[PDB]
Design an enzyme around this catalytic site. Structure first.
Site, PDB file in Angstrom:
ATOM      1  N   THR A   1       0.863  -1.214   0.000  1.00 40.35           N
ATOM      2  CA  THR A   1       0.000   0.000   0.000  1.00 40.35           C
ATOM      3  C   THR A   1       0.892   1.256   0.000  1.00 40.35           C
ATOM      4  O   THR A   1       0.477   2.261  -0.612  1.00 40.35           O
ATOM      5  CB  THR A   1      -1.057  -0.070   1.111  1.00 40.35           C
TER       6      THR A   1
ATOM      7  N   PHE B   1      -6.440   4.644   6.328  1.00 42.13           N
ATOM      8  CA  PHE B   1      -5.737   3.796   7.338  1.00 42.13           C
ATOM      9  C   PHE B   1      -6.748   3.027   8.206  1.00 42.13           C
ATOM     10  O   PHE B   1      -6.368   2.544   9.279  1.00 42.13           O
ATOM     11  CB  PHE B   1      -4.778   4.647   8.196  1.00 42.13           C
TER      12      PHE B   1
ATOM     13  N   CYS C   1      -4.993   0.564  10.986  1.00 41.82           N
ATOM     14  CA  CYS C   1      -3.605   0.257  10.555  1.00 41.82           C
ATOM     15  C   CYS C   1      -2.614   0.455  11.716  1.00 41.82           C
ATOM     16  O   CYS C   1      -2.435   1.581  12.158  1.00 41.82           O
ATOM     17  CB  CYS C   1      -3.209   1.129   9.360  1.00 41.82           C
TER      18      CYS C   1
END
Ligand code: HEM
Ligand SMILES: CCCCCCCCCCCC(=O)O
Length: 458
Positions: free
Chosen positions: A268, A398, A405
Protein backbone atom coordinates in the site's frame (compact mmCIF):
# COMPACT_ATOMS: atom_id res chain seq x y z
CA UNK A 1 -39.05 3.73 9.95
CA UNK A 2 -37.05 1.79 7.25
CA UNK A 3 -36.78 2.65 3.45
CA UNK A 4 -35.83 -0.16 0.97
CA UNK A 5 -32.14 -0.15 -0.19
CA UNK A 6 -31.86 0.04 -4.04
CA UNK A 7 -29.38 -1.99 -6.17
CA UNK A 8 -28.74 -3.47 -9.65
CA UNK A 9 -31.22 -6.30 -10.33
CA UNK A 10 -29.50 -9.72 -9.86
CA UNK A 11 -29.85 -12.92 -11.95
CA UNK A 12 -30.90 -16.39 -10.74
CA UNK A 13 -27.91 -18.43 -9.39
CA UNK A 14 -25.31 -15.62 -9.85
CA UNK A 15 -26.92 -12.47 -8.33
CA UNK A 16 -24.76 -9.48 -9.42
CA UNK A 17 -21.45 -11.45 -9.19
CA UNK A 18 -20.82 -11.53 -13.00
CA UNK A 19 -21.20 -7.66 -13.27
CA UNK A 20 -17.69 -7.34 -11.69
CA UNK A 21 -14.79 -6.57 -14.12
CA UNK A 22 -12.29 -9.43 -13.35
CA UNK A 23 -9.31 -6.96 -13.59
CA UNK A 24 -10.77 -3.78 -11.98
CA UNK A 25 -13.69 -4.70 -9.66
CA UNK A 26 -13.32 -1.25 -7.94
CA UNK A 27 -14.76 0.38 -11.15
CA UNK A 28 -17.93 -1.81 -10.91
CA UNK A 29 -18.33 -0.82 -7.20
CA UNK A 30 -18.01 2.94 -8.02
CA UNK A 31 -20.26 2.89 -11.17
CA UNK A 32 -23.05 1.26 -9.03
CA UNK A 33 -22.40 4.00 -6.36
CA UNK A 34 -22.75 6.73 -9.07
CA UNK A 35 -26.00 5.06 -10.22
CA UNK A 36 -27.84 4.19 -6.89
CA UNK A 37 -26.17 6.70 -4.45
CA UNK A 38 -25.09 6.51 -0.77
CA UNK A 39 -26.19 2.84 -0.25
CA UNK A 40 -27.01 -0.12 -2.60
CA UNK A 41 -27.35 -3.95 -2.31
CA UNK A 42 -25.34 -6.68 -4.11
CA UNK A 43 -26.16 -10.43 -4.12
CA UNK A 44 -22.69 -12.09 -4.15
CA UNK A 45 -21.63 -15.69 -3.36
CA UNK A 46 -20.59 -14.88 0.30
CA UNK A 47 -24.06 -13.23 1.04
CA UNK A 48 -25.97 -9.91 0.46
CA UNK A 49 -23.38 -7.03 0.60
CA UNK A 50 -24.43 -3.39 1.29
CA UNK A 51 -22.18 -0.74 -0.34
CA UNK A 52 -21.94 2.61 1.51
CA UNK A 53 -20.45 5.54 -0.50
CA UNK A 54 -21.26 8.62 1.78
CA UNK A 55 -19.42 10.28 4.73
CA UNK A 56 -22.73 10.30 6.74
CA UNK A 57 -22.99 6.46 6.55
CA UNK A 58 -19.17 5.76 6.77
CA UNK A 59 -19.04 7.82 10.05
CA UNK A 60 -21.95 5.90 11.69
CA UNK A 61 -20.34 2.56 10.58
CA UNK A 62 -17.02 3.67 12.28
CA UNK A 63 -18.78 3.25 15.72
CA UNK A 64 -16.84 0.31 17.33
CA UNK A 65 -19.74 -0.01 19.89
CA UNK A 66 -22.26 -0.99 17.10
CA UNK A 67 -19.97 -2.37 14.26
CA UNK A 68 -16.76 -4.46 13.74
CA UNK A 69 -14.35 -5.71 11.03
CA UNK A 70 -15.84 -9.11 10.11
CA UNK A 71 -13.02 -10.48 7.85
CA UNK A 72 -15.48 -11.19 4.96
CA UNK A 73 -15.31 -11.47 1.13
CA UNK A 74 -11.69 -11.18 -0.20
CA UNK A 75 -10.12 -10.91 3.31
CA UNK A 76 -11.82 -14.17 4.34
CA UNK A 77 -10.13 -15.86 1.31
CA UNK A 78 -6.77 -14.11 2.21
CA UNK A 79 -6.94 -16.30 5.44
CA UNK A 80 -5.99 -19.20 3.09
CA UNK A 81 -2.43 -17.70 3.06
CA UNK A 82 -2.09 -15.97 6.50
CA UNK A 83 -4.87 -17.61 8.65
CA UNK A 84 -5.49 -15.64 11.95
CA UNK A 85 -2.45 -13.33 11.62
CA UNK A 86 -3.03 -9.72 12.68
CA UNK A 87 -4.83 -8.59 9.43
CA UNK A 88 -7.21 -11.58 8.91
CA UNK A 89 -8.03 -12.73 12.51
CA UNK A 90 -11.64 -12.14 13.69
CA UNK A 91 -12.03 -10.03 16.88
CA UNK A 92 -13.21 -13.12 18.94
CA UNK A 93 -10.09 -15.20 17.86
CA UNK A 94 -7.70 -14.90 20.83
CA UNK A 95 -4.70 -14.72 18.39
CA UNK A 96 -5.74 -11.21 17.19
CA UNK A 97 -5.19 -9.89 20.75
CA UNK A 98 -2.01 -11.92 21.46
CA UNK A 99 -0.38 -10.66 18.20
CA UNK A 100 -1.81 -7.08 18.67
CA UNK A 101 -0.51 -6.58 22.25
CA UNK A 102 2.92 -8.22 21.48
CA UNK A 103 3.55 -6.22 18.20
CA UNK A 104 1.97 -2.80 19.06
CA UNK A 105 5.11 -1.47 20.87
CA UNK A 106 7.35 -1.97 17.74
CA UNK A 107 5.30 0.88 16.05
CA UNK A 108 5.57 3.35 19.01
CA UNK A 109 7.05 6.79 18.11
CA UNK A 110 10.41 5.91 19.83
CA UNK A 111 10.81 2.71 17.70
CA UNK A 112 9.68 4.38 14.42
CA UNK A 113 12.30 7.16 14.86
CA UNK A 114 14.81 4.37 15.69
CA UNK A 115 14.19 2.91 12.16
CA UNK A 116 14.85 6.29 10.38
CA UNK A 117 18.55 5.45 9.58
CA UNK A 118 17.61 2.17 7.82
CA UNK A 119 14.62 3.82 6.01
CA UNK A 120 17.14 6.49 4.81
CA UNK A 121 19.59 3.77 3.57
CA UNK A 122 16.99 2.03 1.34
CA UNK A 123 15.77 5.46 0.05
CA UNK A 124 19.48 6.28 -0.80
CA UNK A 125 19.76 2.99 -2.77
CA UNK A 126 16.78 4.13 -4.90
CA UNK A 127 18.19 7.69 -5.27
CA UNK A 128 21.62 6.31 -6.35
CA UNK A 129 19.98 3.81 -8.77
CA UNK A 130 18.14 6.70 -10.54
CA UNK A 131 21.15 9.11 -10.32
CA UNK A 132 23.50 6.42 -11.77
CA UNK A 133 21.04 5.31 -14.55
CA UNK A 134 20.73 8.99 -15.57
CA UNK A 135 17.92 11.01 -17.15
CA UNK A 136 17.22 8.85 -20.31
CA UNK A 137 16.44 5.55 -18.43
CA UNK A 138 12.64 4.99 -18.23
CA UNK A 139 11.70 4.24 -14.58
CA UNK A 140 8.89 1.69 -13.95
CA UNK A 141 7.52 3.76 -11.04
CA UNK A 142 5.55 0.97 -9.26
CA UNK A 143 8.49 -1.51 -9.70
CA UNK A 144 11.11 0.82 -8.08
CA UNK A 145 8.69 1.88 -5.28
CA UNK A 146 7.83 -1.86 -4.60
CA UNK A 147 11.61 -2.51 -4.31
CA UNK A 148 11.92 0.49 -1.92
CA UNK A 149 8.92 -0.44 0.30
CA UNK A 150 9.62 -4.21 0.40
CA UNK A 151 13.34 -3.63 1.21
CA UNK A 152 12.51 -0.89 3.80
CA UNK A 153 9.85 -3.08 5.53
CA UNK A 154 12.08 -6.23 5.60
CA UNK A 155 15.28 -4.40 6.77
CA UNK A 156 13.62 -2.23 9.49
CA UNK A 157 11.26 -4.91 10.99
CA UNK A 158 12.95 -8.33 10.23
CA UNK A 159 16.61 -7.27 9.77
CA UNK A 160 16.46 -9.00 6.34
CA UNK A 161 17.79 -7.65 3.02
CA UNK A 162 15.95 -8.63 -0.23
CA UNK A 163 18.64 -6.41 -1.91
CA UNK A 164 16.00 -5.68 -4.61
CA UNK A 165 18.19 -2.97 -6.27
CA UNK A 166 20.91 -5.64 -7.02
CA UNK A 167 18.47 -7.85 -9.08
CA UNK A 168 16.84 -7.11 -12.48
CA UNK A 169 13.59 -9.01 -11.53
CA UNK A 170 11.44 -8.53 -8.38
CA UNK A 171 11.76 -11.38 -5.83
CA UNK A 172 9.23 -14.18 -6.65
CA UNK A 173 7.33 -13.15 -3.45
CA UNK A 174 5.94 -10.01 -5.26
CA UNK A 175 4.17 -11.91 -8.14
CA UNK A 176 2.99 -14.70 -5.79
CA UNK A 177 1.54 -11.93 -3.54
CA UNK A 178 -0.20 -10.09 -6.41
CA UNK A 179 -1.85 -13.29 -7.71
CA UNK A 180 -2.68 -14.54 -4.13
CA UNK A 181 -4.47 -11.20 -3.41
CA UNK A 182 -6.25 -10.94 -6.83
CA UNK A 183 -7.39 -14.61 -6.79
CA UNK A 184 -8.53 -14.23 -3.12
CA UNK A 185 -11.00 -11.51 -4.37
CA UNK A 186 -11.88 -13.61 -7.46
CA UNK A 187 -12.68 -16.69 -5.28
CA UNK A 188 -15.06 -14.64 -3.04
CA UNK A 189 -16.89 -13.29 -6.19
CA UNK A 190 -17.06 -16.78 -7.87
CA UNK A 191 -20.68 -18.07 -7.85
CA UNK A 192 -21.24 -21.76 -6.84
CA UNK A 193 -22.66 -22.53 -10.36
CA UNK A 194 -19.33 -21.58 -12.20
CA UNK A 195 -16.70 -22.74 -9.58
CA UNK A 196 -15.92 -26.11 -11.23
CA UNK A 197 -14.24 -24.36 -14.31
CA UNK A 198 -11.34 -22.89 -12.18
CA UNK A 199 -9.08 -25.88 -11.31
CA UNK A 200 -5.96 -24.38 -13.06
CA UNK A 201 -6.45 -21.06 -11.09
CA UNK A 202 -6.79 -23.20 -7.90
CA UNK A 203 -3.52 -25.25 -8.28
CA UNK A 204 -1.75 -21.86 -8.96
CA UNK A 205 -3.40 -20.14 -5.90
CA UNK A 206 -1.91 -22.79 -3.48
CA UNK A 207 1.48 -22.74 -5.36
CA UNK A 208 1.66 -18.91 -4.94
CA UNK A 209 0.72 -19.33 -1.20
CA UNK A 210 3.69 -21.80 -0.92
CA UNK A 211 6.06 -19.11 -2.30
CA UNK A 212 4.76 -16.69 0.43
CA UNK A 213 5.26 -19.31 3.24
CA UNK A 214 8.75 -20.27 1.86
CA UNK A 215 9.90 -16.56 1.71
CA UNK A 216 8.78 -16.01 5.37
CA UNK A 217 10.54 -19.31 6.37
CA UNK A 218 13.68 -17.74 4.76
CA UNK A 219 13.41 -14.54 6.90
CA UNK A 220 12.91 -16.64 10.10
CA UNK A 221 15.81 -18.99 9.14
CA UNK A 222 18.09 -15.91 8.64
CA UNK A 223 17.22 -14.66 12.20
CA UNK A 224 17.92 -18.15 13.66
CA UNK A 225 21.24 -18.39 11.77
CA UNK A 226 22.38 -14.75 12.54
CA UNK A 227 20.92 -13.80 15.97
CA UNK A 228 20.83 -10.02 16.74
CA UNK A 229 20.62 -7.97 19.96
CA UNK A 230 18.23 -5.37 18.45
CA UNK A 231 14.52 -5.17 19.31
CA UNK A 232 12.27 -5.28 16.19
CA UNK A 233 8.95 -6.74 14.96
CA UNK A 234 10.57 -10.22 14.54
CA UNK A 235 12.38 -10.23 17.98
CA UNK A 236 8.92 -9.30 19.45
CA UNK A 237 7.28 -12.25 17.56
CA UNK A 238 9.99 -14.76 18.72
CA UNK A 239 10.54 -13.55 22.36
CA UNK A 240 7.45 -11.39 23.26
CA UNK A 241 4.86 -12.80 25.73
CA UNK A 242 1.29 -11.35 26.01
CA UNK A 243 0.72 -10.25 29.68
CA UNK A 244 -3.10 -10.83 29.31
CA UNK A 245 -3.11 -14.51 28.01
CA UNK A 246 0.48 -15.49 29.05
CA UNK A 247 1.11 -16.79 25.44
CA UNK A 248 3.76 -16.30 22.69
CA UNK A 249 3.20 -16.73 18.92
CA UNK A 250 3.41 -20.37 17.58
CA UNK A 251 5.88 -20.79 14.63
CA UNK A 252 2.77 -21.24 12.40
CA UNK A 253 1.60 -17.71 13.57
CA UNK A 254 5.16 -16.22 13.23
CA UNK A 255 5.05 -17.29 9.53
CA UNK A 256 1.42 -15.99 9.24
CA UNK A 257 2.46 -12.56 10.67
CA UNK A 258 5.75 -12.35 8.68
CA UNK A 259 3.74 -12.88 5.41
CA UNK A 260 1.08 -10.35 6.64
CA UNK A 261 3.74 -7.63 7.35
CA UNK A 262 5.73 -8.36 4.10
CA UNK A 263 2.42 -7.68 2.17
CA UNK A 264 0.57 -5.01 4.28
CA UNK A 265 3.95 -3.40 5.14
CA UNK A 266 4.97 -2.54 1.52
CA UNK A 267 2.15 -3.05 -1.07
CA UNK A 268 0.00 0.00 0.00
CA UNK A 269 3.06 2.31 0.57
CA UNK A 270 4.31 1.47 -2.99
CA UNK A 271 0.80 2.47 -4.18
CA UNK A 272 0.86 5.75 -2.18
CA UNK A 273 4.25 6.87 -3.56
CA UNK A 274 3.40 5.69 -7.13
CA UNK A 275 0.08 7.68 -7.18
CA UNK A 276 1.61 10.71 -5.37
CA UNK A 277 4.42 11.07 -8.00
CA UNK A 278 1.86 10.71 -10.88
CA UNK A 279 -0.24 13.49 -9.26
CA UNK A 280 2.74 15.86 -8.52
CA UNK A 281 3.98 15.46 -12.14
CA UNK A 282 0.48 16.11 -13.57
CA UNK A 283 -0.27 19.06 -11.18
CA UNK A 284 2.81 21.33 -11.76
CA UNK A 285 1.43 23.93 -9.27
CA UNK A 286 1.64 21.30 -6.44
CA UNK A 287 4.99 19.94 -7.80
CA UNK A 288 6.50 23.47 -7.40
CA UNK A 289 5.08 23.96 -3.85
CA UNK A 290 6.43 20.52 -2.69
CA UNK A 291 9.89 21.28 -4.24
CA UNK A 292 9.82 24.86 -2.76
CA UNK A 293 9.08 23.33 0.69
CA UNK A 294 11.99 20.81 0.53
CA UNK A 295 14.39 23.60 -0.65
CA UNK A 296 13.39 26.04 2.18
CA UNK A 297 13.25 23.40 5.03
CA UNK A 298 16.04 20.91 4.09
CA UNK A 299 17.89 22.70 1.22
CA UNK A 300 20.93 20.73 0.04
CA UNK A 301 21.73 19.39 3.56
CA UNK A 302 21.01 15.92 5.00
CA UNK A 303 17.42 14.77 5.74
CA UNK A 304 17.25 14.00 9.49
CA UNK A 305 14.30 12.55 11.48
CA UNK A 306 13.30 16.06 12.82
CA UNK A 307 12.42 17.12 9.21
CA UNK A 308 9.54 14.57 8.90
CA UNK A 309 7.14 16.75 10.99
CA UNK A 310 8.57 20.02 9.42
CA UNK A 311 7.23 19.34 5.84
CA UNK A 312 3.49 20.21 6.00
CA UNK A 313 2.96 20.48 2.18
CA UNK A 314 4.46 16.99 1.58
CA UNK A 315 2.14 15.67 4.40
CA UNK A 316 -0.77 17.41 2.53
CA UNK A 317 0.27 15.81 -0.83
CA UNK A 318 0.22 12.32 0.77
CA UNK A 319 -3.14 13.02 2.58
CA UNK A 320 -4.66 14.31 -0.71
CA UNK A 321 -3.21 11.30 -2.65
CA UNK A 322 -4.78 8.85 -0.08
CA UNK A 323 -8.10 10.81 -0.33
CA UNK A 324 -8.41 10.25 -4.15
CA UNK A 325 -6.29 7.02 -4.29
CA UNK A 326 -6.89 5.03 -1.05
CA UNK A 327 -4.60 2.09 -1.89
CA UNK A 328 -6.96 -0.12 0.14
CA UNK A 329 -10.17 1.25 -1.46
CA UNK A 330 -12.75 -0.83 0.52
CA UNK A 331 -12.85 -1.77 4.22
CA UNK A 332 -15.65 -4.00 5.64
CA UNK A 333 -17.88 -3.44 8.69
CA UNK A 334 -20.68 -5.68 10.06
CA UNK A 335 -23.37 -4.84 12.63
CA UNK A 336 -22.95 -6.63 16.06
CA UNK A 337 -26.83 -6.72 16.30
CA UNK A 338 -29.70 -6.07 13.80
CA UNK A 339 -29.37 -2.30 13.22
CA UNK A 340 -30.63 0.81 11.36
CA UNK A 341 -28.23 3.32 9.71
CA UNK A 342 -28.93 6.91 8.51
CA UNK A 343 -32.07 6.19 10.56
CA UNK A 344 -33.82 4.52 7.54
CA UNK A 345 -31.68 1.49 6.37
CA UNK A 346 -32.28 -2.07 7.71
CA UNK A 347 -28.87 -3.82 8.35
CA UNK A 348 -28.67 -7.48 9.66
CA UNK A 349 -26.27 -8.74 12.40
CA UNK A 350 -22.99 -9.93 10.75
CA UNK A 351 -24.24 -8.51 7.33
CA UNK A 352 -21.22 -7.41 5.20
CA UNK A 353 -21.10 -3.59 4.77
CA UNK A 354 -18.48 -2.45 2.20
CA UNK A 355 -17.18 1.08 3.07
CA UNK A 356 -16.28 2.22 -0.52
CA UNK A 357 -13.60 4.75 0.67
CA UNK A 358 -12.69 5.44 -3.01
CA UNK A 359 -16.21 7.07 -3.12
CA UNK A 360 -16.69 8.32 0.60
CA UNK A 361 -13.51 10.39 -0.08
CA UNK A 362 -15.30 12.23 -2.99
CA UNK A 363 -18.51 13.09 -0.95
CA UNK A 364 -19.52 16.52 -2.39
CA UNK A 365 -21.18 17.35 1.01
CA UNK A 366 -17.67 17.31 2.62
CA UNK A 367 -15.15 18.20 -0.12
CA UNK A 368 -17.31 20.41 -2.44
CA UNK A 369 -17.44 20.54 -6.27
CA UNK A 370 -13.57 20.27 -6.33
CA UNK A 371 -13.82 16.75 -4.72
CA UNK A 372 -12.42 14.95 -7.84
CA UNK A 373 -9.46 17.42 -8.23
CA UNK A 374 -5.93 17.05 -6.76
CA UNK A 375 -5.53 20.03 -4.35
CA UNK A 376 -2.97 19.41 -1.55
CA UNK A 377 -3.91 22.85 -0.02
CA UNK A 378 -7.25 21.10 0.94
CA UNK A 379 -5.44 18.73 3.36
CA UNK A 380 -2.99 21.15 5.11
CA UNK A 381 -3.28 20.84 8.95
CA UNK A 382 -5.60 23.88 9.53
CA UNK A 383 -8.23 22.84 6.90
CA UNK A 384 -7.77 19.03 7.48
CA UNK A 385 -8.45 19.41 11.28
CA UNK A 386 -11.54 21.53 10.31
CA UNK A 387 -12.86 18.82 7.90
CA UNK A 388 -12.42 16.12 10.68
CA UNK A 389 -14.26 18.29 13.28
CA UNK A 390 -17.15 19.16 10.86
CA UNK A 391 -17.28 15.75 9.00
CA UNK A 392 -15.69 13.02 11.21
CA UNK A 393 -14.42 9.91 9.22
CA UNK A 394 -14.45 11.97 5.92
CA UNK A 395 -10.90 10.49 5.40
CA UNK A 396 -10.16 6.83 6.41
CA UNK A 397 -7.36 5.40 4.17
CA UNK A 398 -5.74 3.80 7.34
CA UNK A 399 -9.01 2.09 8.46
CA UNK A 400 -10.95 2.57 11.74
CA UNK A 401 -11.11 1.61 15.44
CA UNK A 402 -9.08 -1.09 17.26
CA UNK A 403 -8.78 -2.71 13.72
CA UNK A 404 -7.10 0.43 12.18
CA UNK A 405 -3.60 0.26 10.55
CA UNK A 406 -0.87 -0.65 13.15
CA UNK A 407 1.74 0.42 10.50
CA UNK A 408 0.46 3.98 9.76
CA UNK A 409 3.42 5.79 11.46
CA UNK A 410 5.97 3.50 9.63
CA UNK A 411 4.33 4.22 6.23
CA UNK A 412 4.15 7.97 7.07
CA UNK A 413 7.84 8.42 8.07
CA UNK A 414 8.83 6.34 4.99
CA UNK A 415 6.61 8.24 2.45
CA UNK A 416 7.58 11.75 3.76
CA UNK A 417 11.36 10.88 3.86
CA UNK A 418 11.36 9.32 0.32
CA UNK A 419 9.35 12.20 -1.25
CA UNK A 420 11.68 14.79 0.44
CA UNK A 421 14.83 12.91 -0.69
CA UNK A 422 13.64 12.47 -4.31
CA UNK A 423 12.37 16.11 -4.73
CA UNK A 424 15.66 17.41 -3.20
CA UNK A 425 17.87 15.61 -5.81
CA UNK A 426 15.64 15.20 -8.94
CA UNK A 427 13.06 16.67 -11.26
CA UNK A 428 10.49 14.16 -12.68
CA UNK A 429 8.62 14.08 -16.02
CA UNK A 430 6.19 11.54 -17.55
CA UNK A 431 8.09 9.12 -19.86
CA UNK A 432 4.98 9.31 -22.15
CA UNK A 433 3.69 12.92 -22.04
CA UNK A 434 0.28 11.51 -23.21
CA UNK A 435 0.07 8.95 -20.30
CA UNK A 436 -3.46 8.86 -18.76
CA UNK A 437 -3.75 7.30 -15.24
CA UNK A 438 -5.05 3.68 -15.38
CA UNK A 439 -5.30 1.38 -12.30
CA UNK A 440 -3.83 -2.09 -11.64
CA UNK A 441 -5.90 -3.78 -8.90
CA UNK A 442 -4.55 -6.66 -6.73
CA UNK A 443 -7.34 -5.98 -4.16
CA UNK A 444 -5.00 -2.97 -3.45
CA UNK A 445 -4.55 -0.24 -6.19
CA UNK A 446 -1.49 1.19 -8.05
CA UNK A 447 -0.98 3.07 -11.33
CA UNK A 448 -0.65 0.69 -14.34
CA UNK A 449 2.13 1.17 -16.96
CA UNK A 450 3.27 4.44 -15.27
CA UNK A 451 6.87 5.29 -16.39
CA UNK A 452 8.76 8.52 -15.55
CA UNK A 453 12.32 9.90 -15.89
CA UNK A 454 14.50 11.46 -13.13
CA UNK A 455 16.84 14.38 -14.02
CA UNK A 456 19.36 15.36 -11.28
CA UNK A 457 19.11 19.03 -10.10
CA UNK A 458 21.91 21.72 -10.03
C1 HEM B 1 0.16 4.00 2.69
C2 HEM B 1 0.28 2.87 3.41
C3 HEM B 1 -0.84 2.06 4.05
C4 HEM B 1 -2.22 2.10 3.96
C5 HEM B 1 -3.03 2.97 3.08
C6 HEM B 1 -2.76 1.15 4.87
C7 HEM B 1 -4.16 0.89 5.07
C8 HEM B 1 -4.67 0.00 5.98
C9 HEM B 1 -6.04 -0.30 6.23
C10 HEM B 1 -7.28 0.23 5.60
C11 HEM B 1 -6.12 -1.21 7.18
C12 HEM B 1 -7.43 -1.75 7.69
C13 HEM B 1 -7.97 -3.03 6.98
C14 HEM B 1 -9.44 -3.33 7.32
O1 HEM B 1 -10.16 -2.50 7.96
O2 HEM B 1 -9.92 -4.44 6.94
C15 HEM B 1 -4.79 -1.47 7.57
C16 HEM B 1 -4.46 -2.43 8.49
C17 HEM B 1 -3.18 -2.88 8.70
N1 HEM B 1 -2.04 -2.36 8.20
FE1 HEM B 1 -1.91 -0.88 6.99
N2 HEM B 1 -1.73 0.59 5.51
C18 HEM B 1 -0.55 1.08 5.09
C19 HEM B 1 0.76 0.72 5.48
C20 HEM B 1 1.09 -0.33 6.35
C21 HEM B 1 2.36 -0.64 6.88
C22 HEM B 1 3.64 0.07 6.56
C23 HEM B 1 2.25 -1.69 7.72
C24 HEM B 1 3.29 -2.38 8.51
C25 HEM B 1 4.57 -2.07 8.69
C26 HEM B 1 0.85 -2.04 7.68
C27 HEM B 1 0.29 -3.02 8.43
C28 HEM B 1 -1.05 -3.14 8.66
C29 HEM B 1 -1.56 -4.21 9.53
C30 HEM B 1 -0.85 -5.29 10.31
C31 HEM B 1 -2.87 -4.03 9.56
C32 HEM B 1 -3.77 -4.91 10.39
C33 HEM B 1 -3.99 -4.35 11.80
C34 HEM B 1 -5.17 -5.03 12.52
O3 HEM B 1 -6.36 -5.09 12.04
O4 HEM B 1 -4.93 -5.55 13.65
N3 HEM B 1 0.17 -1.20 6.86
N4 HEM B 1 -3.90 -0.72 6.82
C1 LIG C 1 -2.77 -8.74 3.81
C2 LIG C 1 -3.14 -7.39 3.15
C3 LIG C 1 -4.35 -7.40 2.18
C4 LIG C 1 -5.15 -6.09 1.92
C5 LIG C 1 -6.67 -6.30 1.65
C6 LIG C 1 -7.37 -5.28 0.72
C7 LIG C 1 -8.83 -5.64 0.34
C8 LIG C 1 -9.67 -4.55 -0.41
C9 LIG C 1 -10.58 -5.06 -1.57
C10 LIG C 1 -12.02 -5.45 -1.20
C11 LIG C 1 -12.81 -6.05 -2.37
C12 LIG C 1 -13.90 -7.08 -2.05
O1 LIG C 1 -13.70 -7.97 -1.15
O2 LIG C 1 -14.99 -7.03 -2.70
Amino acid sequence: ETVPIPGPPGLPLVGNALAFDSELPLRTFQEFAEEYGEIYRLTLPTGTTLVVSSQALVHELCDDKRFKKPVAAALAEVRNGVNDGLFTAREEEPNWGIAHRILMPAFGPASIQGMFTEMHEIASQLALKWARHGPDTPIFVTDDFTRLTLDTLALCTMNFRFNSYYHDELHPFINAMGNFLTESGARAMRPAITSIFHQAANRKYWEDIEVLRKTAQGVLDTRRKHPTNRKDLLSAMLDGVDAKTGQKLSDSSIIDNLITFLIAGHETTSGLLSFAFYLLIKHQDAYRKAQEEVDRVIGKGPIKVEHIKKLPYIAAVLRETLRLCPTIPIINRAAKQDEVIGGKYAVAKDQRLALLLAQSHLDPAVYGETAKQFIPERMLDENFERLNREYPDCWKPFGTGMRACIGRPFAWQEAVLVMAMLLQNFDFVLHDPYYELHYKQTLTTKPKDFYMRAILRD
